[PDB]
């Protein structure tokens, strides 16, 4: 009765992704983990799946945050129209952002990162801000957003992620007068765009590391838990921050991102740094008690997975797409041969941490 999630390479490697403070190390909801040159900087190590900025510019405004950010601070404009995408142009006459992922690979080549996310993070990281006058450079780096549908890399020029309150922003034209319109992050699952928001520091070191290293996906048929008395005990709704009923599985996914205790670096009332600590993990499951589905947000770092049919364990960082647990460790797992009946037996192996049963004939 040792814990295989701590013990075994296949299981450990997986469970490691679900220490957010260690693998991400910053606010998720708002990521303002670093500071540079007297500013706040998006710093988090893991990329964030489904994150987008909802805006509250008036209806006439396009209200997309991937729009070219407002180019010349306009007087007759209040609030200031546009989005967050860097609006600069190359000498070529080509827009700095967004860029195709195609364009990236050709120019990046073999030496460059494999993942397109890696590739786009590196675009952002690669970028140096310069003053044409007084030739001056900055080490300040901006967050990228990657659209997985269309395969475009956007570099933003707006590290802000949340703006709230009528002293500072306008909701829906009101109070008119104010330059900035309110915005807040939201996990969104359109079929038309598929966004991933990240720090440019995903690209620092090895840009493809997230893939192996981060809680990128939702897990199907499993529940976060601590390991007690030789077995994995699902965090129960009693030590959860909130465990309200939740209509469906995708609803739980959005709730974790937004819930009021999720790791977040936004200013209270002052540059708060969460280090990733907060209600970031949630269990979705059907209560055996009056059978109402529950979304169970926790702040406890799980160290194992309790497997259960039809369950889903989500995190504030990860995708909405479900994915299997590892069933075995290739390295350690001895192939087991079932009883030879009919001169044929099923034989079970561990190709890529999953059971492939392939039936063989003993005689």
């Amino acid at each position: 009765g040792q814990n295989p999630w701590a013990t075994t390479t296949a299981f450990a490697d997986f469970m490691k992704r679900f220490n957010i403070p260690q693998v991400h190390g910053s606010g998720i909801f708002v990521d303002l983990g670093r500071d540079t040159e007297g500013y706040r900087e998006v710093g988090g190590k893991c990329p964030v799946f489904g994150k987008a900025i909802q805006m509250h510019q008036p209806a006439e405004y396009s209200n997309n945050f991937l729009d070219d950010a407002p180019t010349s601070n306009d007087a007759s404009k209040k609030p200031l129209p546009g989005g967050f995408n860097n609006p600069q142009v190359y000498t070529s006459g080509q827009k700095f952002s967004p860029i195709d992922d195609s364009l990236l690979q050709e120019r990046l080549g073999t030496a460059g990162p494999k993942t397109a996310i890696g590739r786009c993070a590196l675009y952002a990281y690669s970028t140096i801000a310069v003053n044409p006058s007084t030739n001056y450079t900055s080490t300040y780096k901006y967050p990228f957003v990657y659209d997985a549908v269309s395969r475009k890399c956007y570099v933003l020029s707006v590290s802000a992620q949340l703006l709230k309150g009528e002293k500072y922003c306008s909701v829906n034209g009101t109070p008119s007068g104010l330059t900035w319109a309110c915005f807040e992050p939201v996990k969104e699952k359109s079929s038309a765009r598929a966004l991933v928001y990240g720090s440019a520091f995903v690209a620092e070191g090895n840009p493809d590391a997230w893939q192996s290293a981060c809680p990128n996906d939702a897990v199907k048929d499993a529940l976060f838990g601590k390991w007690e008395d030789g077995q994995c005990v699902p965090f129960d709704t009693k030590t959860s921050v909130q465990s309200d009923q939740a209509t469906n599985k995708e609803e739980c996914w959005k709730r974790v991102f937004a819930n009021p205790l999720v790791a977040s670096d936004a200013p209270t009332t002052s540059s708060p740094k969460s280090g990733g600590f907060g209600a970031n993990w949630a269990n979705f499951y059907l209560e055996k008690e009056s059978g109402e589905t529950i979304c169970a947000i926790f702040d406890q770092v799980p160290d194992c997975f309790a497997p259960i049919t039809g369950a889903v364990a989500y995190t504030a960082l990860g995708s909405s797409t479900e994915v299997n647990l590892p069933q075995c460790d290739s390295a350690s797992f001895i192939p087991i041969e079932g009883p030879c009946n009919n001169c044929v037996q099923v034989v079970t192996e561990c190709v890529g941490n999953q059971f492939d049963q392939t039936s063989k004939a003993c005689c």
């Binding site: 500013y39 600069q88 142009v89 675009y123 801000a129 020029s157």
Partner: peptide, 30 residues
Amino acid sequence: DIAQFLTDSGMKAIEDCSWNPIMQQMACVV
């Protein structure tokens, strides 16, 4: 002012240009 709070929300006034070694061009605000 209040804009103490806006910098403290991640707001930063960009610089006119960028250099990118992947494209090896200078991109500037039009």
